[PDB]
Amino acid sequence: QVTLYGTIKAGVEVSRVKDAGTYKAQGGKSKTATQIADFGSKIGFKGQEDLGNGMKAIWQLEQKASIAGTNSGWGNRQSFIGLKGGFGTVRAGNLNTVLKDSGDNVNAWESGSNTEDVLGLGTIGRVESREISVRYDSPVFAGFSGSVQYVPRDNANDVDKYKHTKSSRESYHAGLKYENAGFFGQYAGSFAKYADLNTDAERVAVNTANAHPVKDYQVHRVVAGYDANDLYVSVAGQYEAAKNNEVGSIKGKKHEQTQVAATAAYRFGNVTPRVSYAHGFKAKVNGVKDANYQYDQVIVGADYDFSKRTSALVSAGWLKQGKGAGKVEQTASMVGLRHKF
Amino acid sequence: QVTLYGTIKAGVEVSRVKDAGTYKAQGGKSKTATQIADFGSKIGFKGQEDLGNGMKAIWQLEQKASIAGTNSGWGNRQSFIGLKGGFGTVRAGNLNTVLKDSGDNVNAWESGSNTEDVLGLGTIGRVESREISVRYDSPVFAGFSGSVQYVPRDNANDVDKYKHTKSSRESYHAGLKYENAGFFGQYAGSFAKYADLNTDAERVAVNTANAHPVKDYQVHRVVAGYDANDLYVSVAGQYEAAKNNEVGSIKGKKHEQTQVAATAAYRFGNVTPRVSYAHGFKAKVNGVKDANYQYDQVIVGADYDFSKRTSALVSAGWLKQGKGAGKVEQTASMVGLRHKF
Amino acid sequence: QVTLYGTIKAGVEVSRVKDAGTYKAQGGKSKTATQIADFGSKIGFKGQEDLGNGMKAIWQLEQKASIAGTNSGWGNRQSFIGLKGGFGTVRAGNLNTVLKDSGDNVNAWESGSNTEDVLGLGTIGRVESREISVRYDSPVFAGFSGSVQYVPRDNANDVDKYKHTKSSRESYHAGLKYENAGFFGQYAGSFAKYADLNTDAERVAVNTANAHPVKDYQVHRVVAGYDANDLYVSVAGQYEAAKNNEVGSIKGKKHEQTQVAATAAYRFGNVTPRVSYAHGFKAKVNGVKDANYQYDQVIVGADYDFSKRTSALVSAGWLKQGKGAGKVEQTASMVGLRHKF
Ligand SMILES: Nc1ncnc2c1ncn2[C@@H]1O[C@H](COP(=O)(O)OP(=O)(O)NP(=O)(O)O)[C@@H](O)[C@H]1O
Ligand SMILES: Nc1ncnc2c1ncn2[C@@H]1O[C@H](COP(=O)(O)OP(=O)(O)NP(=O)(O)O)[C@@H](O)[C@H]1O
Ligand SMILES: Nc1ncnc2c1ncn2[C@@H]1O[C@H](COP(=O)(O)OP(=O)(O)NP(=O)(O)O)[C@@H](O)[C@H]1O
């Protein structure tokens, strides 16, 4: 007994960008783009066998499958082999980062990738990812459960396996959760002595074009709220920081940014209207306040549940990035459809 | 309840090309190539759930799967999410073009890709394709059923989303069918104010190497015939046309070509012998009759049905393209096997 | 009735290479690499339908699926369509080479690809592969069974289909087996009048960078042993040879190498400890003894069977290649997990 599952979701999204810099049209406004777009359809195959005592062997293979036909490859979404039992769970493979899992309580919007940032809290989710790694998940001991994860230096860099000439990009991810009477609160974070970021502050493979090496990269997230009684309100606080490691005397200088997000919604019969606010404060790059990284976003919308596996979706979102003249404003809205199986 | 399906088909095909131009061997003849070749194996996953009233949510993910191992990717064959009910059907995703669907009644031959043109009416099928799009399919109202399809400018060109600096390649596909007492007749066509063609007259993505931009591109197909009583006879008429839009004073000049095809077959117990004839008339390119596009093809063959899902196949085909000295003649024959699941 | 199956296997492997030449660290020693690594997870879809008499139609689509997410594509592992019945079996598609099948009795170790050579008898398995081809498998006529396989010139080279200007790389693979009272002994080999090798002596596509064309390439394998009674002992002997066909007066000169391998193991309840020894003799390249191709390897390890589909794995291996100063020594060990479904 092996099981097949997935999700299928598509919809048409509408958007426009207000950017003085790369738009020469009147007043910096882009035209308005109207597109049909897959929202991240997926399809997996998980299974489990009982081992005799409390133990169960477990595995999963999940792939991006976009109904627009733009994906390819196996196990490119969470996939793994593991063992489960008294002690809790132990998994190894392409694994959701403890911070990516905590992303559920923080960004629940559906959208195409060209809009993950305006129609979803994509900016705060920029720290989430999947990593080849080992992960331990503790049982829920009465309100509490815990997760510890680790990524090998030689899995975080494969070419450098035999010559340790590049500093380790091995990282540690760990989380602590608490659920009770609708109440929940969790802490999740990650730390890597050495890592590399692109200019959007997302982590990238060592040696990617224009990656900026960093030291002591750490991320902290804290979410809390209440989910039950046709009711949900969630508040998240995130803190990112690292030192400059790139060649040339900027090295040692501090990078850091703080984001906060809040979302609440209620189910009124089959409709669940929702709303989210998110803010990214000014950032300190190489020790200097850089207002290019500051932003504001609010998203509103609802889902009409045709059934427990099928929903109709709608949302509009607004985003403001940076300040003054380098200002970038994005506005989008969509209507789609999701079917879980 | 989600269902798995597909088809598997392979066979060995034999071929030779008579082309004075790119063959220096005696008299323009190529050697004779003998190959094992996948005929387009595929594998999908479709599903549906009832929604409460006459409505049903529907989806599919179908992928090219060639047993020779040369394919990769998900949803690269018709895949989609849709809703079905009283009003008929509504789908969105990688969708068979209304003209690709009408291809069933017009080219039913199985073959490898290196022979889609001699062992199949591939030339008349050059107007068929799949497009990210929305599609409506009307219920059969007593003999009649109808289909309307549309491809967004921003799905027909994604890079140009925000700068509308390139003319829309958005297109409309629509069909009308009629079935009764074995009798059927359908019209199917498509129209795009702006499109782009390669030299084989097939549509290509804006900006492909050597694509020729065109204006008012329209295709018309008409098929009619009789399928029942161990009996099938089909006749198709197709008309393609467009204006020249490419840079440089050839612009505005007319392109056009007409093709006709005919196929008939009968089931004598488990064998179904079949035969097809197809003709492409001289073409008018930039206002001038170009006999390079004219051709003649006849295909004969049969299928021995081992069971309702398994068949053995055989066919020979002959094709003549262009005239005089630029003449290209292709001849092939194959024997294969197909298994539907 | 179509069936889904596969295997999932991952584990962490540890390794170090002692190579004076490409390591400048003290004494030629590399650092020690510690990696999580997929061992070749896979997932297939096979099926069969009865045809009425003793005959059954059969098919399979099997894909590399690595839980680390590094694979993509369909049918890239054995996949095919075939017919089975009184006469035995007939298959066509991506097919395991008769010599790749005989690989079961000769290399049974699990490992990641970066260690297929030290943690597995990978070196002797260098002659195994999959080829688009047709294959016949005779029924077992009381102890004996047989296999004959063939790869078309036009499937072994596709570009050269119409101009036969390159000599045929078409090859023949054939095997003969015998099983009885735990006893078994098989012969398996292949022969190609023209082929091409890389410097590791593995076969490569015509025209690959740095491939060395060869004439009369033939491989001979012979394995024998006893598997039953919680008992296994296997001995293999292999002989490879070819003539030089590359441009420039080295042509016509003899290449040849001999390898032998031996492995035995016993099941003591759920544990099955195992051990293997393998040796590659000096090689004759262009008529000259080349000790660069000579090697020695011993692998020890066991599998603890959690159940008939789940095992825990462990192994260490040691390998010595070439002689004197060009000497390359590899040592690795791993612990992993496998789950068949
Ligand atoms: N690599 C990525 N880059 C950008 N966005 C992503 C990436 N991976 C996932 N996402 C988005 O973030 C979401 C993460 O998954 P989620 O929303 O929890 O649904 P899911 O993956 O089907 N369920 P789960 O298994 O719990 O993750 C996806 O729906 C994507 O829209
Ligand atoms: N992109 C393409 N280019 C060239 N030939 C194609 C392409 N797509 C499909 N074909 C061929 O045309 C046929 C179209 O599908 P068809 O013959 O109807 O079988 P099917 O796809 O299994 N069923 P359906 O879902 O009704 O299309 C395929 O069998 C292919 O041989
Ligand atoms: N192309 C390849 N290159 C290198 N190693 C390979 C290749 N293909 C397979 N292998 C390895 O050799 C083994 C061949 O398959 P095998 O060990 O018999 O397991 P299997 O493929 O699941 N079963 P079978 O269908 O009998 O081959 C795989 O487990 C791989 O580890």
Coordinates of all heavy atoms in Angstrom, one line a residue, chain B residues 153-187:
Chain B
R153 N -2.2 36.9 -25.3 CA -1.1 37.6 -25.9 C 0.1 37.4 -25.0 O 1.2 37.2 -25.5 CB -1.4 39.1 -26.0 CG -1.1 39.9 -24.7 CD -2.2 39.8 -23.6 NE -3.1 38.6 -23.6 CZ -4.3 38.5 -24.2 NH1 -4.7 39.5 -24.9 NH2 -5.0 37.4 -24.1
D154 N -0.2 37.4 -23.7 CA 0.9 37.2 -22.7 C 1.2 35.8 -22.4 O 2.0 35.6 -21.5 CB 0.5 38.0 -21.5 CG 0.5 39.5 -21.7 OD1 1.4 40.0 -22.5 OD2 -0.3 40.3 -21.1
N155 N 0.6 34.9 -23.1 CA 0.8 33.5 -22.9 C 1.4 33.0 -24.3 O 2.0 32.0 -24.4 CB -0.4 32.7 -22.8 CG -0.9 32.6 -21.3 OD1 -0.4 31.9 -20.5 ND2 -2.0 33.4 -21.0
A156 N 1.2 33.9 -25.3 CA 1.7 33.6 -26.6 C 3.0 34.3 -26.7 O 3.8 34.2 -27.7 CB 0.7 34.1 -27.7
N157 N 3.3 35.2 -25.8 CA 4.6 35.9 -25.7 C 4.5 36.3 -24.2 O 3.6 36.9 -23.7 CB 4.6 37.1 -26.7 CG 5.9 37.9 -26.7 OD1 6.7 37.7 -25.8 ND2 6.1 38.7 -27.7
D158 N 5.6 35.9 -23.5 CA 5.6 36.1 -22.0 C 6.6 37.3 -21.8 O 6.3 38.1 -20.9 CB 6.2 35.0 -21.2 CG 6.6 35.4 -19.8 OD1 7.6 36.0 -19.6 OD2 5.8 35.1 -18.9
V159 N 7.7 37.3 -22.4 CA 8.7 38.3 -22.2 C 8.2 39.8 -22.4 O 8.5 40.7 -21.7 CB 9.9 38.1 -23.2 CG1 10.2 39.4 -24.0 CG2 11.2 37.7 -22.5
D160 N 7.3 39.9 -23.4 CA 6.6 41.2 -23.8 C 5.4 41.6 -22.9 O 4.7 42.5 -23.3 CB 6.3 41.2 -25.3 CG 6.3 42.5 -25.9 OD1 7.4 43.2 -25.8 OD2 5.3 42.9 -26.5
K161 N 5.2 40.9 -21.8 CA 4.1 41.1 -20.9 C 3.8 42.6 -20.5 O 2.7 43.0 -20.6 CB 4.4 40.4 -19.5 CG 4.0 39.0 -19.3 CD 4.6 38.5 -18.0 CE 6.1 38.7 -18.0 NZ 6.8 38.2 -16.7
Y162 N 4.9 43.2 -20.1 CA 4.8 44.6 -19.6 C 5.1 45.7 -20.6 O 4.7 46.9 -20.4 CB 5.8 44.8 -18.4 CG 5.4 43.8 -17.3 CD1 6.3 42.9 -16.9 CD2 4.1 43.8 -16.8 CE1 5.9 42.0 -15.9 CE2 3.7 42.9 -15.8 CZ 4.6 42.0 -15.4 OH 4.3 41.1 -14.4
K163 N 5.8 45.4 -21.7 CA 6.0 46.4 -22.8 C 5.2 45.8 -23.9 O 5.4 44.7 -24.3 CB 7.4 46.4 -23.3 CG 8.5 46.6 -22.2 CD 9.8 46.8 -22.9 CE 10.5 48.1 -22.6 NZ 11.7 47.9 -21.6
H164 N 4.1 46.5 -24.3 CA 3.4 45.9 -25.5 C 4.1 46.7 -26.6 O 3.8 47.9 -26.8 CB 1.9 46.2 -25.4 CG 1.3 45.5 -24.2 ND1 0.8 46.3 -23.1 CD2 1.1 44.2 -23.8 CE1 0.3 45.5 -22.2 NE2 0.5 44.2 -22.6
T165 N 5.1 46.1 -27.2 CA 6.0 46.7 -28.2 C 6.0 45.7 -29.4 O 6.3 46.1 -30.5 CB 7.5 47.0 -27.8 OG1 8.2 45.7 -27.6 CG2 7.6 47.8 -26.6
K166 N 5.5 44.5 -29.1 CA 5.4 43.5 -30.2 C 3.9 43.2 -30.4 O 3.1 43.1 -29.4 CB 6.1 42.2 -29.8 CG 7.6 42.2 -30.2 CD 7.8 41.5 -31.6 CE 9.3 41.2 -31.8 NZ 9.6 40.2 -32.9
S167 N 3.4 43.1 -31.6 CA 2.0 42.9 -31.9 C 1.6 41.5 -31.4 O 2.3 40.5 -31.5 CB 1.7 43.0 -33.3 OG 2.6 43.9 -34.0
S168 N 0.4 41.5 -30.8 CA -0.2 40.3 -30.2 C -0.3 39.0 -31.1 O -0.7 39.1 -32.3 CB -1.7 40.5 -29.7 OG -1.7 41.5 -28.7
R169 N 0.2 37.9 -30.5 CA 0.2 36.6 -31.2 C -0.9 35.8 -30.6 O -1.0 34.6 -30.7 CB 1.6 35.9 -31.0 CG 2.6 36.1 -32.1 CD 3.0 37.5 -32.4 NE 4.0 37.5 -33.5 CZ 4.5 38.6 -34.0 NH1 4.2 39.8 -33.4 NH2 5.4 38.6 -35.0
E170 N -1.8 36.5 -29.9 CA -3.0 35.9 -29.3 C -3.8 35.3 -30.4 O -4.0 36.0 -31.4 CB -3.8 36.9 -28.5 CG -4.7 37.8 -29.3 CD -5.4 38.9 -28.6 OE1 -4.6 39.8 -28.0 OE2 -6.6 39.0 -28.6
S171 N -4.4 34.1 -30.2 CA -5.2 33.5 -31.3 C -6.5 32.9 -30.8 O -6.6 32.7 -29.6 CB -4.3 32.4 -32.0 OG -3.8 31.5 -31.0
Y172 N -7.4 32.7 -31.7 CA -8.7 32.1 -31.4 C -8.9 30.8 -32.3 O -8.7 30.8 -33.5 CB -9.8 33.0 -31.8 CG -9.8 34.4 -31.1 CD1 -8.9 35.4 -31.6 CD2 -10.7 34.7 -30.1 CE1 -8.9 36.7 -31.0 CE2 -10.6 35.9 -29.4 CZ -9.8 36.9 -29.9 OH -9.8 38.2 -29.3
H173 N -9.3 29.8 -31.6 CA -9.5 28.5 -32.2 C -11.0 28.1 -31.9 O -11.5 28.3 -30.8 CB -8.6 27.4 -31.6 CG -7.2 27.8 -31.7 ND1 -6.7 28.8 -30.9 CD2 -6.1 27.4 -32.4 CE1 -5.4 29.0 -31.2 NE2 -5.0 28.2 -32.1
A174 N -11.7 27.6 -33.0 CA -13.1 27.3 -32.8 C -13.5 26.2 -33.7 O -13.0 26.1 -34.8 CB -13.9 28.5 -33.0
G175 N -14.4 25.3 -33.2 CA -14.9 24.2 -34.0 C -16.3 23.9 -33.8 O -16.9 24.3 -32.8
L176 N -16.9 23.3 -34.8 CA -18.3 22.9 -34.8 C -18.5 21.5 -35.3 O -18.1 21.2 -36.4 CB -19.1 23.9 -35.6 CG -20.6 23.7 -35.5 CD1 -21.0 24.1 -34.0 CD2 -21.4 24.5 -36.5
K177 N -19.1 20.6 -34.5 CA -19.2 19.2 -35.0 C -20.7 18.7 -35.1 O -21.6 19.4 -34.6 CB -18.4 18.3 -34.1 CG -18.1 16.9 -34.7 CD -17.3 15.9 -33.9 CE -17.1 14.7 -34.8 NZ -16.2 13.6 -34.2
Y178 N -20.8 17.6 -35.8 CA -22.1 17.0 -36.0 C -22.0 15.5 -36.2 O -21.3 15.0 -37.1 CB -22.8 17.6 -37.3 CG -24.1 16.9 -37.6 CD1 -25.3 17.5 -37.2 CD2 -24.2 15.6 -38.1 CE1 -26.6 16.8 -37.3 CE2 -25.4 14.9 -38.2 CZ -26.6 15.5 -37.8 OH -27.8 14.8 -37.9
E179 N -22.6 14.7 -35.4 CA -22.5 13.3 -35.4 C -24.0 12.7 -35.5 O -24.8 13.2 -34.8 CB -21.8 12.7 -34.2 CG -20.4 13.1 -34.1 CD -19.8 12.8 -32.7 OE1 -20.5 12.8 -31.7 OE2 -18.5 12.5 -32.7
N180 N -24.2 11.7 -36.3 CA -25.5 11.0 -36.4 C -25.5 9.8 -37.3 O -24.9 9.8 -38.3 CB -26.5 12.1 -36.8 CG -27.9 11.5 -37.0 OD1 -28.3 10.5 -36.4 ND2 -28.7 12.2 -37.9
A181 N -26.2 8.8 -36.8 CA -26.3 7.5 -37.6 C -25.1 7.2 -38.3 O -25.1 6.9 -39.5 CB -27.5 7.7 -38.5
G182 N -23.9 7.2 -37.7 CA -22.6 6.9 -38.3 C -22.1 8.1 -39.0 O -20.9 8.2 -39.3
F183 N -22.9 9.1 -39.3 CA -22.5 10.3 -40.1 C -22.0 11.4 -39.2 O -22.4 11.5 -38.0 CB -23.7 10.9 -40.8 CG -24.1 10.1 -42.1 CD1 -25.0 9.1 -42.1 CD2 -23.4 10.3 -43.3 CE1 -25.2 8.3 -43.2 CE2 -23.6 9.6 -44.4 CZ -24.5 8.6 -44.4
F184 N -21.0 12.1 -39.7 CA -20.3 13.2 -39.0 C -19.7 14.1 -40.0 O -19.3 13.8 -41.1 CB -19.2 12.6 -38.0 CG -18.0 12.2 -38.8 CD1 -17.0 13.1 -39.1 CD2 -17.8 10.9 -39.1 CE1 -15.9 12.7 -39.8 CE2 -16.6 10.4 -39.8 CZ -15.7 11.4 -40.1
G185 N -19.6 15.4 -39.5 CA -19.1 16.4 -40.3 C -18.7 17.6 -39.4 O -19.5 18.0 -38.6
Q186 N -17.5 18.0 -39.5 CA -17.0 19.1 -38.6 C -16.2 20.1 -39.3 O -15.6 19.9 -40.4 CB -16.2 18.5 -37.5 CG -15.0 17.7 -38.0 CD -14.1 17.2 -36.8 OE1 -14.0 17.9 -35.8 NE2 -13.5 16.1 -37.0
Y187 N -16.2 21.3 -38.7 CA -15.5 22.5 -39.2 C -14.6 22.8 -38.1 O -15.0 22.8 -36.9 CB -16.4 23.6 -39.6 CG -15.6 24.9 -39.6 CD1 -14.9 25.3 -40.7 CD2 -15.5 25.7 -38.4 CE1 -14.0 26.4 -40.7 CE2 -14.6 26.8 -38.4 CZ -13.9 27.1 -39.5 OH -13.0 28.2 -39.4

